[PDB]
Amino acid sequence: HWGYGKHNGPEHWHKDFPIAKGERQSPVDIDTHTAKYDPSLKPLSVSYDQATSLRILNNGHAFNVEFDDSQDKAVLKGGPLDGTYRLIQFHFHWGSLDGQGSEHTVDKKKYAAELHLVHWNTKYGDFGKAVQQPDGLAVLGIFLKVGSAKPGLQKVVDVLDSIKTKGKSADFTNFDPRGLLPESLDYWTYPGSLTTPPLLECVTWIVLKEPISVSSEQVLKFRKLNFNGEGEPEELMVDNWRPAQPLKNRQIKASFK
Ligand SMILES: CC1=CC(=O)NS(=O)(=O)O1
Ligand SMILES: CC1=CC(=O)NS(=O)(=O)O1
Ligand SMILES: CC1=CC(=O)NS(=O)(=O)O1
Ligand SMILES: CC1=CC(=O)NS(=O)(=O)O1
Ligand SMILES: CC1=CC(=O)NS(=O)(=O)O1
Ligand SMILES: CC1=CC(=O)NS(=O)(=O)O1
Ligand SMILES: [Zn+2]
Predict the structure, then answer these.
(1) Which of 14, 61, 104, 119 is catalytic?
(2) 56 lies in which domain range?
(3) Is the CB of 110 under 6 A from ligand 2?
């Protein structure tokens, strides 16, 4: 089964998921000088004030903070998007070392980690239907660099010991995802895919220009998570990122000059 090890990592995924070599795979390198400023791109509308977080889960590949997506409580609109996309979960990808960890890169630079806020297009009715459509998901990607602590991240970091191993979950109510956003909502956007199997080509990627800073202690605690289940040999959950994939016949657009 797929993962991030030497024998089941990203270079093997195409054998079970041939779309891994498809025409709109993610992540990609964002070449800042080649991205095209599009003055017609609207500002992003991030409406998270009514968000209802529920639970945090170690799924063996990352951890997901899950939200109530049965109503329009936390929605992403605007930018390149038509219609309304509901927040279903967020998760991160991170490295074994501060020098790597992000999935998208910027002029080939790898950040320490990358946050993915996952939203599905409400016109399809649920996430399972949305992933089958070329405009089914909108993922807000936010880079993490190591520096000052991110206060709005600490409640996540502090609960990780309760979900150390694959299959563990914990209550995670009353968490405010607005605390994970940078100041600016300037962004790049392009059509892409899920970055894990099944790698479906259903994502409008919206990658924020401005990273958030997290402390070395915060990212160190991510690296204490385990890919394995309890009672199995310990394998640290680190380097759970897919490398940049060929851009092929796509142009990255920028919301900002
Ligand atoms: C390095 C590694 C990563 C993974 O995803 N699965 S594994 O626990 O078999 O080994
Ligand atoms: C150019 C570049 C290459 C790489 O792999 N990691 S990095 O973050 O040092 O930046
Ligand atoms: C994942 C996790 C993070 C932490 O802070 N302590 S712990 O090593 O018990 O488990
Ligand atoms: C659920 C989900 C799966 C994935 O692989 N990429 S994503 O960031 O769109 O979120
Ligand atoms: C719900 C689930 C199924 C899917 O299609 N992609 S995912 O593996 O990211 O999560
Ligand atoms: C897990 C651990 C335990 C503690 O008490 N303080 S700390 O935040 O430095 O790291
Ligand atoms: Zn992701």
Answers:
(1) 61
(2) 1-257
(3) yes
Residue 24: CB within 6 Å of ligand 2?
no
Calculate the alpha carbon distances from 235 to 4, 96, 137, 191 in Å: 11, 12, 31, 33
Rg (CA), the chain: 17
CA–CA distances in Å: residue 87 to residues 52, 64, 91, 192, 238 = 10, 12, 12, 18, 25
Half-sphere exposure of 186 (CA within 13 A, CB side): 12
Domain harbouring 61, CATH code: 3.10.200.10
The resolution in Å comes to 1.5
The count of structural domains within the chain is 1
In order of 27, 42, 148, the CA distances from 190 in angstroms are 10, 14, 30
Neighbours of ion ligand 7 (CB under 5 A): 116
Q: What method was applied to determine this entry?
A: X-ray
Residue 65 C-beta-side C-alpha neighbours within 13 Å: 23
